[PDB]
């Protein structure tokens, strides 16, 4: 029978104590959701270790025996519980496969109501036990809920598991090598898990190294087609070559008149030359040997000779002496293999093995020769000679390893070997003109991209076995575990299915709806989580609108929002520098000398994040120090209605305001962070400095001293600014201030309510934090080095190799520190911008109103306060926004006397029966005048222009 | 993708995990330049049925609805400017979306003034927007009214000159061009860095694995992975510091989309 | 486990089996004594530029 594991299994990875933060871990685990077997004993594999447990109530279960034959015939564990002791053996049982119950040598070792759970592996010959207990009130089902298990043995016995038994209902599951994530609690228990591997979720919840993961798409992997089948491919030759004869020659040359035989047209089976005992040296120089039988050679020639044992080892690339010289010489990137052999016996009686370019030979002369008598020392003896030179695969194979080869399946993904050119790819035919002697063709990146096929000689395209990442669509684990695949690119034919032009969309459901965006997917393509499923769609590019457009037709406002358009700037990383030596080498001395092999790196380094550190203070100090004096605020808050009692300092409080509090609330070794120089009290003092300015003063204090103005009078030029006539502040004053004050409401509200209100901030406090984490957990990266550990270089190896397994562990961790020094200058610009933009918004923005159009937050710009937070600064933008119109007509001009007036500022409208000036951005008609509008010329130049009366402002005067 | 390579690339750290992670926030920076430019538009204002613009002839710059959608503008743009573990990734608003969301910016700068910056699109008249042009350079509006017919004739004209001036000359769309060449010079280069040696005995990595044991393959092996990971770092440097240069452009373009298209800039030139 | 640091004696519950802690990313911010099982916090010691 079977049975749902759920979760149960996981177990305690490392001896780590972690307080209440998540470690993502591989290891052999019982996956999430397994098919569980159900037992009521018989023998079982082991496979790669096992989770098992007895649901218990009167102690019928007492343990296990283990091994690879799980009984004394040989590598076996007897491992019996009995409460609160435990015993185990290895020399051989006196009892079968369990002893009897209640109704040459080397080891030992001794130390339903409830379930009782265990885990069981072998790793580098420690094995494991991890274990639990908890209640239970149920027999016939593993309980929906989570405990870890915890080691009671970890014993180096060296015996390796593939079978086991039980001694005494059961259940059994197998592990996997797996990626999991663990919620190591405040109390560093494991209070919940995830297997990475389970589903589109677990990869998702992995990638975050979080037990919720927000609504998003996530690049959780990368899908390749895996090949199907391997195809393997050589000229159909069974010709046999003839090493037989050339290793065993009669006589070989004088190495001064080397011979040279080219081999050629057949099948050489080199592991008979490798696995021979004949040959005392058979040193290779672009290839290793066992391969060699997997390669087809496009020629091949043995070159051979005898020449005694003191000069057999010139024969090699880069040597010289009397045969490396002029009597017989390799390129110094020669391909092939050189075999040589003592040969006294087949040399030695004799004299005539006469001696004197790369292949060169010169026979011209009093040339010199070897004297081989029997009686030669080792050195001097004889010793028979074959360089197997080797041709390259840029040309027609000729010679081939013994393989197999098989049928030429097209259109399958495919391992592919062809005359020992390897690979994977989807093979097929081609319209290329190859030319008669051409064997392969190539990409720009070099790597074959045609061959022509061994056996038929027609003319293959050879292309890559399709692939693209693994993007997952959660609908944020809050709203559900109902989770859709993008498979980036890849046509669905090759993976509810649906397909984009970004790739193959798995798990969705296709919607013709135009809805909004929510999770964007590629292409145009945009998932939401709808009544449930998660849809995917044509996103709408926001809704539609027909503007009610005509020559005519005008929308004044009638009415506006004041609002408080939060817009968030970060202003400094977080001031950093390093200690070189100390990141590089834990000033640990060894390591200390060798980074001055390198120079002035260490130094460049420092000035680099020196520079770095005074421009995050130069940022601060010109962001925030744009007025020469802390101006204080009044005792008395006499604004007209305003009500900046959150925003400005609380003297109760560090002297932050509230929602600076608020804000500095929700946003949350050789390396130092340095304190920036204005510290937060400091700059708590210069942001209400700013802000109390702001307030008191206005503008002013930008240009000369402050020059102090009521606030309702300072809204009065703000509304100017943005050509709204300043007693609509005025007639609306404390309708305003009620906006403003419940906007200012709403933002304590929004900012207490979610953190993507303080978005770029938190964003860039974990920039820096991963960034500095990458640093830190780059120490613990290997390079290619023996240990990340430097230490347990240095207590390890011979100074020599120590030196070289250093020089690349600090060659990595400097090109990591340098990557992170990149990091930092390229993020430094990333920042200067935004601390320059937030200079520039608090120079133009809140000591000036800027008329840039949508600088400001995200409307026609007022005024805004400038808040501290953490390495940042937040601008509360008061942007005017219209918010209520009307349709109304309109003309660009009137006439009168045929003469045509134009508005002095505002726009001409009528209801219908009435025509009026009003201005540009809200609805006070006023009647025409000669004092609202200016002539010019004559009318009939004008396109759209309007008969009326204007009102003469004197007429009252001459009636009266 | 070959296990005997990418056993020793896991070695080598955070690296190519931060290297595909500042790859991708790349990609998520060019979506994101593409809406925080072409974005700030929160409903598609279509165009109206009847186009009596004062004389202002927009029909080169607005979609032509018989084409994906583009102007006709856009066409000439399209017609100018011109596998190995690489990808491109699709821009979110596709080449279609964005013809759409830049004729959206369009008819809210036709029908709706700067209004649709701030409010929602208010609609007003074209030629009563360009008075509330003129007198955003101290021009007054009757200079444009007692000059709308000529007005309109000047950028026809001019929109004739462009669509020339496009036409004929390649160059014309040189930062474009010279930012395709950029990274297509910078992929070929990257690409070409697969086949450099770096002193290992082969461009080819495949071949390394076909000739050597995985004890001496690991030195050649680490050399070319050494060679490649820095040629890599390099490309993703170039592309990082190219990647200032267009979001550079992109908030440039944004403030231009801002104060240039959603409304006017007295930032002279 | 070694290093340098200044030892400090610390209210932190590690389990019957752990040995060590650790901070936000690897660092071996604390350990049990293998004497007498108490926990000691290991701060860093004290570094800054001249
Ligand atoms: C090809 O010609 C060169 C001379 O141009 C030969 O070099 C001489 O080799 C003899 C060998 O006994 C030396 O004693 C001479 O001193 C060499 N002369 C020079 C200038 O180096 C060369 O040996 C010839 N090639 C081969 C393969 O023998
Ligand atoms: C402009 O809009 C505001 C709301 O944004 C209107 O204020 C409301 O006025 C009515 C009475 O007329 C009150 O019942 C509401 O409680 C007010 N709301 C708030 C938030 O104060 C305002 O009256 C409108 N002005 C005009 C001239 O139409
Ligand atoms: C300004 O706003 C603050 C709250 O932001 C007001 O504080 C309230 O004051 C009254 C009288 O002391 C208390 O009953 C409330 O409980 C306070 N509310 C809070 C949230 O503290 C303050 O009265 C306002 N002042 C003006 C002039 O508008
Ligand atoms: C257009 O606006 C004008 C002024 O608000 C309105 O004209 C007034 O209408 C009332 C009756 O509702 C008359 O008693 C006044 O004598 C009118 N004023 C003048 C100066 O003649 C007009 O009614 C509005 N029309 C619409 C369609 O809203
Ligand atoms: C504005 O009113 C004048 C009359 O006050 C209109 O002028 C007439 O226009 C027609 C067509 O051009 C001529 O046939 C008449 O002879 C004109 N009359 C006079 C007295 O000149 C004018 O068309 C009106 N314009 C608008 C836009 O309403
Ligand atoms: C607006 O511009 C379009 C071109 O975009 C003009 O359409 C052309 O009109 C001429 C005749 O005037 C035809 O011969 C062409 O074939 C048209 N070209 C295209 C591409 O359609 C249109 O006439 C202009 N309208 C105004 C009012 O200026
Ligand atoms: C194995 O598990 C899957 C769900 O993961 C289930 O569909 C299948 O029926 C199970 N098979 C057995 C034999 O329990
Ligand atoms: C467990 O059994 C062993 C012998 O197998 C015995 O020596 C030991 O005292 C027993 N302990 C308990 C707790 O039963
Ligand atoms: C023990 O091993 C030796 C060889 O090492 C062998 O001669 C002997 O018969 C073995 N005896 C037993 C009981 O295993
Ligand atoms: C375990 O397996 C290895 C081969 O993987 C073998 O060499 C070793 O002898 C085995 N262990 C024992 C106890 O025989
Ligand atoms: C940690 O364990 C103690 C008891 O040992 C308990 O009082 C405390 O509540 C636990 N911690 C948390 C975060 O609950
Ligand atoms: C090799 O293939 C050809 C046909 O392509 C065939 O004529 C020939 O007989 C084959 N070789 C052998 C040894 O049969
Ligand atoms: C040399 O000849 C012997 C038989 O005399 C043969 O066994 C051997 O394999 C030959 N050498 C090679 C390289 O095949
Ligand atoms: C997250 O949970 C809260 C309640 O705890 C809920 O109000 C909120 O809407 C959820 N988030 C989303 C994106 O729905
Ligand atoms: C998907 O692949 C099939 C062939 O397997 C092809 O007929 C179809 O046109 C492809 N579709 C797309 C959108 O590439
Ligand atoms: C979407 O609309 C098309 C017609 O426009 C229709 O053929 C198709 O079945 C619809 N699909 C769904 C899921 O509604
Ligand atoms: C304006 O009026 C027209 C009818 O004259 C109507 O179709 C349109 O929807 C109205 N627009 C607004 C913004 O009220
Ligand atoms: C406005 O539009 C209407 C309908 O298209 C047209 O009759 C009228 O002549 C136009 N007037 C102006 C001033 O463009």
Same mark, same amino acid.
């Given at each position: ?39 009521? *004993? ?19 279960? #007492? ?21 609160? *002791? ?78 086991? %038994? ?8 197998? =592990? ?68 037989? !004869? ?26 008979? =030359? ?24 496009? *020629? ?69 020769? &070897? ?24 040309? $027609? ?60 000689? !027609? ?138 092999? &390198? ?16 421009? %995050?203070?130069?940022?601060?100090? !010109? ?50 962070? /340095? ?12 942001? @209400? ?41 005025? !007639? ?19 900012? @207490? ?18 960034? /500095? ?31 070289? %397994? ?25 920042? #200067? ?36 937070? $953490? ?20 003309? $660009? ?57 204007? &009102? ?9 | ?68 959608? #583009? ?19 699709? $821009? ?78 390649? @160059? ?39 000739? /050597? ?57």
């Amino acid at each position: 029978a079977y049975t749902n594991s759920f979760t149960r299994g996981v177990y305690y990875p490392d001896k780590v104590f972690r307080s209440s933060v998540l470690h993502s871990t591989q290891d052999l685990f019982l996956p999430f959701f397994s098919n569980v077997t159900w037992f009521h *004993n018989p023998v079982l594999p082991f496979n790669d270790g096992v989770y098992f447990a007895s649901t218990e109530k009167s102690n019928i279960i #007492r343990g296990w025996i283990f091994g690879t034959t799980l009984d004394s015939k040989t590598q076996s564990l007897l491992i019996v519980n009995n409460a609160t *002791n435990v015993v185990i053996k290895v020399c051989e049982f006196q009892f079968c496969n369990d002893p009897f119950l209640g109704v040459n040598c080397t080891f030992e070792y001794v130390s339903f109501k409830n379930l009782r759970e265990f885990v069981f592996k072998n790793i580098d010959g420690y094995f494991k036990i991890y274990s639990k207990h908890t209640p239970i009130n149920l027999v016939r089902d593993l309980p929906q809920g989570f405990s870890a298990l915890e080691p009671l043995v970890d014993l180096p016995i060296g015996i390796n598991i593939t079978r086991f %038994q039980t001694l005494l209902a059961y259940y059994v599951g197998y =592990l996997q090598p797996r990626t999991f994530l663990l919620k190591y609690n405040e109390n560093g228990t494991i209070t919940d898990a995830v297997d990475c591997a389970l589903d589109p979720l677990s990869e998702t919840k992995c990638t975050l190294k979080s037990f919720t993961v927000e609504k998003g798409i996530y690049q959780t992997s990368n899908f390749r087609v895996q090949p199907t089948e391997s195809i393997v491919r050589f000229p159909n030759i069974t010709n046999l070559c003839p090493f037989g !004869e050339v290793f065993n020659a009669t006589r070989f040359a004088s190495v001064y008149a080397w011979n040279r035989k080219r081999i050629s047209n057949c099948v050489a089976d080199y592991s008979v =030359l490798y696995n021979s005992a004949s040959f005392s040296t058979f040193k290779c120089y672009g290839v290793s040997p066992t391969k060699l039988n997997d390669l087809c050679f496009t *020629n091949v020639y043995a070159d051979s000779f005898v020449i005694r044992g003191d000069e057999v080892r010139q024969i090699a690339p880069g040597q010289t002496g009397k045969i490396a010289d002029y009597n017989y010489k390799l390129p110094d990137d020669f391909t092939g293999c050189v075999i040589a052999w003592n040969s006294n016996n087949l040399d030695s009686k004799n004299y005539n093995y006469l001696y004197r370019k790369p292949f060169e030979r010169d026979i011209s002369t009093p040339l010199q020769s &070897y004297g081989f008598q029997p009686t030669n020392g080792v050195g001097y003896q004889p010793y028979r000679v074959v360089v197997l030179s080797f041709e390259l695969l840029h040309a $027609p194979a000729t010679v081939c390893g013994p393989k197999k080869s098989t049928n030429l399946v097209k259109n399958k993904c495919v391992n592919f070997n062809f005359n020992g050119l390897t690979g994977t790819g989807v093979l097929t035919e081609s319209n290329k003109k190859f030319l008669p002697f051409q064997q392969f063709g190539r990409d720009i990146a070099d790597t074959t991209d045609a061959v022509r096929d061994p056996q038929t000689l !027609e003319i293959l395209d050879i292309t890559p076995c399709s692939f693209g990442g693994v993007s997952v669509i959660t609908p944020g684990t809050n709203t559900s575990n109902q989770v859709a695949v993008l498979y980036q690119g890849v046509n669905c034919t090759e993976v509810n299915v649906f397909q984009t032009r970004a790739g193959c969309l798995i798990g969705a459901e296709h919607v013709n709806n135009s809805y909004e965006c929510d999770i964007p997917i590629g292409a145009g393509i945009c998932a939401s989580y709808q009544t449930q499923s998660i849809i995917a769609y044509t996103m709408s590019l926001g809704a539609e609108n027909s503007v009610a457009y005509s020559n005519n037709s005008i929308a004044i406002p009638t009415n506006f929002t004041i609002s408080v358009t939060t817009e968030i700037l970060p202003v400094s990383m977080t001031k950093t520098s390093v200690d070189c030596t100390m990141y590089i080498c834990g000033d640990s001395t060894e390591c200390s000398n060798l980074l001055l092999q &390198y120079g002035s790196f260490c130094t460049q380094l420092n000035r680099a994040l020196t520079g770095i550190a005074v421009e %995050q203070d130069k940022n601060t100090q !010109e962001v925030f120090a744009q007025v020469k004096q802390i101006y204080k605020t009044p005792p008395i808050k006499d604004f007209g209605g305003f009500n900046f009692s959150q925003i400005l300092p609380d003297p109760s409080k560090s002297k932050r305001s509230f929602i600076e509090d608020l804000l500095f609330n929700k946003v949350t070794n050789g390396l130092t962070v /340095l304190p920036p120089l204005l510290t937060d009290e400091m700059i708590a003092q210069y942001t @209400s400095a700013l802000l109390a300015g702001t307030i008191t003063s206005g503008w002013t204090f930008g240009a000369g001293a402050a020059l102090q103005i009521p606030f309702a009078m300072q809204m009065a030029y703000r509304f100017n600014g943005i050509g709204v006539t300043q007693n609509v502040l005025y !007639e609306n004053q404390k309708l305003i201030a009620n906006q403003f004050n419940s906007a200012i409401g709403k933002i304590q509200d929004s900012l @207490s309510s979610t953190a993507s209100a303080l978005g770029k901030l938190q964003d860039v406090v974990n920039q820096n934090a991963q960034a /500095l984490n990458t640093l830190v957990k780059q120490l613990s990266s290997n390079f290619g080095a023996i240990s990340s550990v430097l230490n347990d270089i240095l207590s390890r190896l011979d100074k020599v190799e120590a030196e070289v %397994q250093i020089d690349r562990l600090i060659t990595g961790r400097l090109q990591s520190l340098q990557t992170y020094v990149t990091q930092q200058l390229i993020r430094a610009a990333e920042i #200067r911008a935004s601390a320059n933009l937030a200079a520039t918004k608090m120079s133009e923005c809140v000591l000036g109103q800027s008329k840039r159009v949508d600088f400001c937050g995200k409307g026609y710009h007022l005024m805004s306060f400038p808040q501290s937070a $953490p390495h940042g600064v937040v601008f509360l933008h008061v942007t005017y926004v219209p918010a209520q119109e009307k349709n109304f007509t309109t003309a $660009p001009a009137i006439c009168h006397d045929g003469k045509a007036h134009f508005p002095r500022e505002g726009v001409f409208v009528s209801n219908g029966t009435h025509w009026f000036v009003t201005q540009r951005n809200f609805y006070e008609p006023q009647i025409i005048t000669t004092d609202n509008t200016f002539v010019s010329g004559n009318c009939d130049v004008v396109i759209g222009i309007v008969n009326n009366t204007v &009102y003469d402002p004197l007429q009252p005067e001459l009636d009266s | 993708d070959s296990t005997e390579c990418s056993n020793l690339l896991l070695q080598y750290g955070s690296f190519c995990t931060q290297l595909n992670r500042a790859l991708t926030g790349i990609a998520v920076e060019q979506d994101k330049n593409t809406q925080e430019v072409f974005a700030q538009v929160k409903q598609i204002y279509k165009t109206p049925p009847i186009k009596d613009f004062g004389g202002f002839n927009f029909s080169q710059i607005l979609p032509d609805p018989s084409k994906s959608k #583009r102007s006709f503008i856009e066409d000439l743009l399209f017609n100018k400017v011109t596998f190995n573990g690489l990808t491109v990734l699709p $821009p979110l608003l596709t080449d279609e979306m964005i013809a759409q969301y830049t004729s959206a910016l369009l008819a809210g700068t036709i029908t709706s003034g700067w209004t649709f910056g701030a409010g929602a699109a208010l609609q007003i008249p074209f030629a009563m927007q360009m008075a509330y042009r003129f007198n955003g350079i101290g021009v007054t509006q009757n200079v444009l009214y007692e000059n709308q017919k000529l007005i309109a004739n000047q950028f026809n004209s001019a929109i004739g000159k462009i669509q020339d001036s496009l036409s004929s000359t390649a @160059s014309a769309l040189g930062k474009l061009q010279d930012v395709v060449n950029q990274n297509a010079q910078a992929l070929n280069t990257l690409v070409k860095q697969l086949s450099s040696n770096f002193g290992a005995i082969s461009s080819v990595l495949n071949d390394i694995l076909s000739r /050597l044991d995985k004890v001496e393959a690991e030195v050649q092996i680490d050399r070319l992975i050494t060679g490649r990971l820095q040629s890599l770092q390099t490309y993703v440097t170039q592309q990082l510091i190219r990647a200032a240069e267009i979001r550079a452009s992109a908030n440039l373009a944004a403030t231009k989309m801002s104060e240039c298209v959603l409304g006017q800039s007295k930032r002279v030139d």
